[PDB]
Each structure stands twice: as C-alpha cells, then as structure tokens.
Design an enzyme around this catalytic site. Structure first.
Site, PDB file in Angstrom:
ATOM      1  N   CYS A  31       0.833  -1.202   0.000  1.00 35.69           N
ATOM      2  CA  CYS A  31       0.000   0.000   0.000  1.00 35.69           C
ATOM      3  C   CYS A  31       0.870   1.255   0.000  1.00 35.69           C
ATOM      4  O   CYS A  31       1.509   1.573   1.003  1.00 35.69           O
ATOM      5  CB  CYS A  31      -0.925   0.023   1.223  1.00 35.69           C
ATOM      6  N   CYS A  34       4.688   1.625  -3.776  1.00 36.65           N
ATOM      7  CA  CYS A  34       4.799   0.335  -4.451  1.00 36.65           C
ATOM      8  C   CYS A  34       3.740   0.190  -5.542  1.00 36.65           C
ATOM      9  O   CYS A  34       3.929  -0.550  -6.508  1.00 36.65           O
ATOM     10  CB  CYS A  34       4.667  -0.806  -3.441  1.00 36.65           C
TER      11      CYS A  34
END
Length: 104
Positions: A31, A34
């Site tokens: 989260c 990324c």
C-alpha cells in the site's frame, strides 16, 4: 522496455553477461509508492532505449526474493557489472531517471 521475470534463468543470465543496465523492482503491493510509482517507472520504461526492468513480487516468483533479501519498500537496484553497485531503495520517481539515465 519492461520485462517479466518468470524463471530464475532470466535473472541469472542477466547478471552474468549483462553489461547493459539491469533494473530490479521488489514490491509485494502492500500500500503506497509500491503501487503509486508503478505507472511512473513503467511509463519511464518507454523513455529509455536500453533499460532492463525486472519486475518481482514475492510469491509470484519465490526464487529471487528468496536469495535477494528485500529490505525496503519498494526495493530497486542497478546492475552494470553483474554486481550491485548503484542501488536505489527508497521512494521517488525522479530517482529512476537520474539513476537509469546514469548507468545507461
């Protein structure tokens, strides 16, 4: 150009006689950057002329992530002489240009 590493061979042989720029990306899509930086680096892939983008998660491969212990989020590294020299593990798009454009 963006590559997909399915077999360790694509990664191993890439570190052997891989003189060009070999980039790696380790992100299990937790989260954050990324997933937010996915388009960035992926988009910049169309900018360079000889940049090897190696995509790797965790379970999808289990080969690289196993040996190449991840210690960041995400984790990017640059191989020029079959040896990690110009790594870049943090969080910033621009870091790809100045990085890839350097080893290129």
């Amino acid at each position: 150009m963006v590559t997909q590493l399915k077999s360790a061979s694509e990664y191993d042989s890439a570190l052997a006689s891989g003189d060009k720029l070999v980039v790696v990306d380790f992100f299990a899509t937790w989260c954050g950057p990324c997933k937010m930086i996915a388009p960035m680096i992926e988009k910049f892939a169309e900018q360079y002329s000889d940049a090897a983008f190696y995509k790797l998660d965790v379970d999808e491969v289990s080969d690289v992530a196993q040996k190449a212990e991840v210690s960041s989020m995400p984790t990017l590294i640059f191989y020029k002489g079959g040896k990690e020299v110009t790594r870049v593990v943090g969080a910033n798009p621009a870091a790809i240009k100045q990085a890839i454009a350097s080893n290129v």
